[PDB]
Amino acid sequence: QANLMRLKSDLFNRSPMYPGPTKDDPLTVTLGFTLQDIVKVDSSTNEVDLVYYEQQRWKLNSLMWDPNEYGNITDFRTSAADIWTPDITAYSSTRPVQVLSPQIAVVTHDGSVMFIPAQRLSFMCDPTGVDSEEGVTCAVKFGSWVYSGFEIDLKTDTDQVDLSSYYASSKYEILSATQTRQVQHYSCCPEPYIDVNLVVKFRER
Amino acid sequence: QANLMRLKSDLFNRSPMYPGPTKDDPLTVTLGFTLQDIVKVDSSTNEVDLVYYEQQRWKLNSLMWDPNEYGNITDFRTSAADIWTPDITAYSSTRPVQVLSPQIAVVTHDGSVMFIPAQRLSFMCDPTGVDSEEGVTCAVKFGSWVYSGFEIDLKTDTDQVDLSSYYASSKYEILSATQTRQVQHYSCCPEPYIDVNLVVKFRER
Amino acid sequence: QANLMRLKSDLFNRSPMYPGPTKDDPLTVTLGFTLQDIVKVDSSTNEVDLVYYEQQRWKLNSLMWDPNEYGNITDFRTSAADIWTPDITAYSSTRPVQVLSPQIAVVTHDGSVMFIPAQRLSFMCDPTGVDSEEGVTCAVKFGSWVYSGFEIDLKTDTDQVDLSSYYASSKYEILSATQTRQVQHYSCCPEPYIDVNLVVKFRER
Amino acid sequence: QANLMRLKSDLFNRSPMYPGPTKDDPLTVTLGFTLQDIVKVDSSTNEVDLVYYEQQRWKLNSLMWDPNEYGNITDFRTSAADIWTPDITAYSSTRPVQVLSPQIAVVTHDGSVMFIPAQRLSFMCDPTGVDSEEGVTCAVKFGSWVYSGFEIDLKTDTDQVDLSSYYASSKYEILSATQTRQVQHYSCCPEPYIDVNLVVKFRER
Amino acid sequence: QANLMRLKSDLFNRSPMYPGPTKDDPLTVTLGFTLQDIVKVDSSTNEVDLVYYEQQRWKLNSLMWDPNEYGNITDFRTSAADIWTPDITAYSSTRPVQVLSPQIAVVTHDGSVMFIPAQRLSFMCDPTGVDSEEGVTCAVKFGSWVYSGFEIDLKTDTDQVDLSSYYASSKYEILSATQTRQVQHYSCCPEPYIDVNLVVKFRER
Ligand SMILES: O=C1C[C@@H]2OCC=C3CN4CC[C@]56c7ccccc7N1[C@H]5[C@H]2[C@H]3C[C@H]46
Ligand SMILES: O=C1C[C@@H]2OCC=C3CN4CC[C@]56c7ccccc7N1[C@H]5[C@H]2[C@H]3C[C@H]46
Ligand SMILES: O=C1C[C@@H]2OCC=C3CN4CC[C@]56c7ccccc7N1[C@H]5[C@H]2[C@H]3C[C@H]46
Ligand SMILES: O=C1C[C@@H]2OCC=C3CN4CC[C@]56c7ccccc7N1[C@H]5[C@H]2[C@H]3C[C@H]46
Ligand SMILES: O=C1C[C@@H]2OCC=C3CN4CC[C@]56c7ccccc7N1[C@H]5[C@H]2[C@H]3C[C@H]46
Ligand SMILES: O=C1C[C@@H]2OCC=C3CN4CC[C@]56c7ccccc7N1[C@H]5[C@H]2[C@H]3C[C@H]46
């Protein structure tokens, strides 16, 4: 429809793409996980596979508009390729992440963006003890691959992983699942890198 | 030939692409499933693999034309990349869906589109009981990834999955297969959501 | 060299792309299979894997030229991406077909095209009996995914599959292999649908 | 640097790409194999996997230049996608060939090109006897997919496969490995076809 | 923001891309490995799989700028596709390397670049003795595919692999891991090639 076509043209066809954040114009990315299932455990290679929805949110001044100028449109959906997205990645995957959903974002008129890719991830975890009452704990950090906390500030809205969509007939019972922001300085370099530590304790049903 | 070339140039090369539905101009997408086989059952990971044809229908005003101005052309085939297509996806897949057919659609002069991707899907299902007389029931929801019921309404022409192409020498006997529209709210979000729930009850033949 | 560059420019750069066949301007695609090996039999999932060359031939008026105008060039080779190709698809594959050869076609001055992709196909087949003297029969239909017989007709040059390149040390002996044009009529629709049925009867050697 | 940028611009931006060889202007491609390892043997499917470097060499008038006109530049490297490359392919692979290295060619001022991709190939071979003192022989032919001997002639610099890079701790001992030009006529076609027959005799070490 | 947009436009949009190093203008690439885990050992195929970060650094005059002309910007992140990158490859992989991180690099105003792809690599290694106290040693060389030491030289900052991020619950104990620059004259080629030899001695923990 007319007004939305006009809006997208104005936002995407008139200016160079947003080049990403810098120290002088940093960006906060909010990150949250919805765990769907632990789909595989391999005790011979120490690899565990998760399926989850990863919710990312950020806000750009360059994506703002006045709804009155565009037929009262307050938000729209658009391919994630049309916009800048943050390079948030798992620090200890063992295979390329697999994307399970369309790559499409929702942009709201205040310039906020929501992008929630469904993914299957293989990561490093020794599952020894998963077949016991105590279960086993695995952990994987997510964070920007090359932006420091001076450019991208990561945060969470809550430290509790969302389990309301966890598969009811999973081989595994989730004992706990938290997602915790950490600020780390690595030996080589003075700038902080932010991560969100996904920590899941589980056992066989 | 010349008339079809002209029609496609007018439909596709003269205006911005359709930007997708909105709350003001919502769209109805009709879904239908043709189940071909249950090709894998994994009781160690609770994953089941299906091969099916997914029929999708919708109608756009911007794809309409008068056959009289285009040599009586009443419909045409065109690459799916030339047109907007709905972001219908399975909500509980465990691996990227694999497409088995050419991505080509049929567009009719009244603006209606028919697109029928053949797919192999791995999804979450505990198959315990499949080797019994009672069998086992699996279920997977399909719906838009990013549009709520505000923008995309879904429906089925029938609640019965088409089994007329089900592989006659399958490992599995289909006891029942239904495709039902559901309306649902999620704790994550304020909008009504619409999905089509594919429910298949089956046993080893 | 110069004449061939000029010809390709005239054929591909100077006109809109051919929009494919229609009822008014139908096409005939000739199909022929060269079976190289039956490379896998899976009796747990009822899947069988074939490697073969699939020969496709058709003719377009828009690909004709007078050799006298182009230095006696009578044919040329070019990327299949440069030309329209028919959407011939296996109707019962269980995985995306894998292409084993370069996608390059031969175009002749009468407008005729020859394209012969080598492929690995997994398709639905219960191989029970393969280890017996009588062997087992598998079948898979190939046809246009989106076109009816009103736009694309199919034929074979011979109903006998070419076994002259069948792997001499294969695990399997081919007892018979045929490729037969078939017509399918559906209650819903006046237009006939065409396929070529590849039927292979085989046993362990 | 400046001189090289100018040369590449002159070679690749001012003329349409070379349209490949023809009967009038045929091309000789020289082929050589460097076998690194036999990395899998499957006696249940009769498939063997090789890892090797495949050296291809040819020469094009259109790639020539006077080094005196370009700052004494005598050769340069560029992405293989920048230039025409021959459609040399294994005739009996069972899976798409996997490329293990960058795809970059070396171009020399006399118009000669050298391109040496590292590859992993699965191909048809019954390995029965590999565990014996006699070993087993496998063979796979390589040649143009669409060009006859009238357009592309193949040759080797030597009949002996290069084993100087063969993995010192391979599971397999190479007893002989040859690469031999063959001219063949096929019933399918009236003109001669050229292949290089890679023949490897090996046993478990 | 505005200044970064201008910088990228000036660096990338205003001039031809860097055509890579030459004998007249050679380059030095610094390599460092951070070994995260030995994720698979296959004694039937002699293949071992590593997961590591590979840090690459180089410097280009054409990537320099004066921060005073660009709002004090001293560095920026950009897609690796925007810049030239060196063709550093493992010389003995058995499968295509899998990239685990976004392909993005950091460019600094002196023209230096830092690119750190995380990767999973399968490579040739007979792991016999891995299950002993002595352990086993594997090695894989990394170097330019097409540039000799006269065009691309390599160096490490240290000959010790960074083991600070090695998975604490790995199946394998690392006995030693070094990364050493080597110069090699291969019988195939008159100019020597430089590699960094990654040598890992390990055993089951
Ligand atoms: O020193 C490190 C190790 C640490 O490893 C976890 C993952 C990280 C994500 N990216 C990958 C490269 C890295 C980085 C950038 C600049 C200097 C050092 C450095 N790294 C990793 C680091 C974090 C942050 C960043
Ligand atoms: O937490 C959820 C689960 C629910 O799953 C079914 C599919 C949905 C379609 N889209 C996919 C992403 C989702 C959504 C957005 C923001 C936070 C959580 C979230 N999801 C899914 C949700 C619905 C609605 C929406
Ligand atoms: O009734 C069918 C089933 C059959 O399935 C195999 C594949 C086919 C390729 N396309 C997909 C849609 C289809 C078709 C068109 C019109 C009415 C029925 C109908 N189909 C499939 C059919 C063939 C032909 C065609
Ligand atoms: O236009 C179509 C194509 C599609 O093909 C897959 C199978 C289907 C199952 N049945 C077979 C006939 C069909 C149908 C009925 C009425 C008009 C069109 C039409 N078809 C197929 C269709 C689905 C649904 C239905
Ligand atoms: O019937 C054949 C088999 C033979 O197989 C080996 C490889 C060849 C290289 N290309 C691949 C396609 C082929 C060809 C073209 C047209 C009709 C049949 C046909 N083929 C192969 C043939 C040769 C020559 C040519
Ligand atoms: O024969 C070889 C083996 C050697 O292997 C290690 C890596 C090298 C880097 N590039 C990759 C291709 C190679 C080369 C070019 C032309 C003929 C043979 C050939 N190779 C490798 C060689 C070096 C140099 C060069």
SS (H, E, C) A119-161: EEEEEECCCCCCCCCCCEEEEEEEEECCCCCCCEEEECCCCEC
Q: How far is the CA of B106 from the centre of ligand 4 (A)?
A: 13
And the tokens for B137? 């029931």
| φ and ψ of A143, to 5 deg | -175, 170
And the tokens for D119? 């590859």
Query: Entry resolution in angstroms?
Result: 1.9
Euclidean distance between CA atoms D156 and D178, whole angstroms = 10
- Max CA pair span of chain C: 61
Contact present, E and B (at least 3 Cβ pairs less than 8 Å): no
And the tokens for A163? 């389990």
Query: CA nearest D29: which of D54, D63, D66?
Result: D54
Please state, as a whole number, how many other Cβ atoms lie within 10 Å of the Cβ of residue E179: 22
Euclidean distance between CA atoms A205 and A133, whole angstroms = 9
Give yes or no for a contact between B87 and A104, defined as CB atoms under 8 angstroms apart: yes
**CB-CB under 8 Å, E164 with A24:** no
- Decide whether any atom of ligand 5 lies within 6 Å of the C34 Cβ: yes
- Structure-token match 């390709």, residue found: C8
A109 has binding-site annotation: no
Residues in chain B with CB shorter than 8 Å from the CB of C47 are 39
Q: Which domains are seen in chain D, by residue range?
A: 1-205 (2.70.170.10)
Residues in chain E with CB shorter than 8 Å from the CB of D37 are 46, 94, 124
Give yes or no for a contact between B36 and B51, defined as CB atoms under 8 angstroms apart: yes
DSSP state of A93: B
Query: CA nearest A37: which of B12, B122, B135, C99?
Result: B122
Please state, as a whole number, how many other Cβ atoms lie within 10 Å of the Cβ of residue A176: 13
Residues in chain E with CB shorter than 8 Å from the CB of D39 are 45-47, 94, 124
Residues 6+ apart with CB under 8 A from C69: none
Q: How far is the CA of B55 from the centre of ligand 3 (A)?
A: 10
And the tokens for C151? 């736009």
Residues 6+ apart with CB under 8 A from D7: D65, D70, D73, D76
Name the experimental technique.
X-ray
Euclidean distance between CA atoms B149 and B194, whole angstroms = 5
| Residue numbers belonging to the annotated binding site of D for Mg(2+) | 75, 148, 151, 185, 191
Give yes or no for a contact between C194 and C153, defined as CB atoms under 8 angstroms apart: yes
- Decide whether any atom of ligand 1 lies within 6 Å of the A193 Cβ: yes
C25 has binding-site annotation: no
B133 has binding-site annotation: no
- Measured between CA atoms, the residue of chain D closest to residue C5 is D19
Q: What is the DSSP string of D60-124?
A: EEEEE--GGGTTT--EEEEEGGGS----EEESSBSSPPEE-S--EEEEETEEEEEE--EEEEEEE
Q: What is the CA radius of gyration of chain C?
A: 19
Binning chain C into helix, strand and coil, the percentages to the nearest 5 are 10, 50, 40
- Measured between CA atoms, the residue of chain D closest to residue C115 is D146
Which residues of C lie closer than 8 Å to D, measured between beta carbons?
A: 1, 4-5, 8-9, 36-37, 39-40, 51, 71, 73, 76-78, 98-102, 104-106, 116, 118, 120, 162, 164, 167, 169-171
Query: CA nearest A40: which of E40, B121, B45?
Result: B45
Query: CA nearest C150: which of C187, C189, C195, C191?
Result: C191
E strand spans, A43-103: 47-64, 75-79, 88-90, 98-99
Identify the chains in contact with C, defined as 3+ C-beta pairs within 8 A.
B, D
**CB-CB under 8 Å, E147 with D164:** no
> Which amino acid belongs to residue B176?
S
- Decide whether any atom of ligand 5 lies within 6 Å of the D145 Cβ: yes
Out of E20, E89, E92, whose CB is closest to D36?
A: E92
Out of E4, E36, E73, whose CB is closest to A92?
A: E36
| φ and ψ of E156, to 5 deg | -115, 155
Euclidean distance between CA atoms B180 and D168, whole angstroms = 61
3-state secondary structure chain B: CHHHHHHHHHHHCCCCCCCCCCCCCCEEEEEEEEEEEEEEEECCCCEEEEEEEEEEEEEEEEEECCHHHCCCCCEEEEEHHHCCCCCEEECCECCCCEECCCCEEEEECEEEEEECCEEEEEEECCCCCCCCCCCEEEEEEEEECCCCCCCEEEECCCCECECCCCCCCCCEEEEEEEEEEEEECCCCCCCCEEEEEEEEEEEEC
Task: Give me the count of residues in chain E.
Answer: 205
3-class SS at C82? helix
**CB-CB under 8 Å, E1 with A22:** yes
CA atoms within 13 A on the CB side of C114: 15
Q: In the beta sheet, which residues pair with residue D109? A: none
Residues in chain D with CB shorter than 8 Å from the CB of C98 are 95-96
